[model samples]
Target: LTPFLILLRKTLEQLQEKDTGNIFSEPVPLSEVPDYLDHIKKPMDFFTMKQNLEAYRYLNFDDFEEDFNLIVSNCLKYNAKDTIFYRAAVRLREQGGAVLRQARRQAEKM
Candidate 1:
């Protein structure tokens, strides 16, 4: 319950501190990215995740984790590896993955 919420916020905060975090913190605007939806069927962002969390939409850790990973996956799918977006996603994925696993262990102890 609150355990996952705490972990989610912690991970979000960490990722948000990075230089590329601002780019990923919010949703990609269709107006700015005209073809965004065409490539990514499911678009995910940290802001949306927070909104979902506040709305009590996630039932458990896995539910939260799925959306968390989607943020990075969507970026990787849309951006080339040479770009900052792709590199940032790679770093965030590593950071988030470790944070999630650690959080899982802590949550499981409860």
Candidate 2:
């Protein structure tokens, strides 16, 4: 299970343990959240993350939004995958894909 998913599981368990009703939103079943948090299992590091930021650029292509969307579409369409940083971007698309997109762009500038 992904750490984020594991954190979600632990979060629910804590909610139940503390009986803190309504503090946490019960969006979905604890049993099923793991099913949703698929095992992409990617880890980003400082040195590598910077290079990875410019990965698409390394190939002389600065369209991470394009590549990122492509990665996501590939996964959702084909159920194939990658190192998994892309998975969080796909998930964050729910909040707003631009959040990660801008973050990635800024990181590229750094």
Best by TM-score: 1
Worst 10 residues of 1 by lDDT: 12-21
Which lDDT tens digits does candidate 2 get at residues 35-90?
43354333222223234443433332243334334434433433334634345435
What is the C-alpha lDDT profile of model 1 across 1-110, one tens digit per residue?
68667776776666566535487888988998899999998899888888887788876778888998898899999998899889989888887887778877877877
Scored by lDDT, the top model is 1
What is the Cα-based TM-score of model 1?
A: 0.87
Clashing pairs in 2: none
Give the C-alpha miss distance for residue 38 in model 1, angstroms: 0.1
- TM accuracy, model 2: 0.28
lDDT of 2: 0.36
lDDT of every predicted structure (CA atoms): 0.81, 0.36
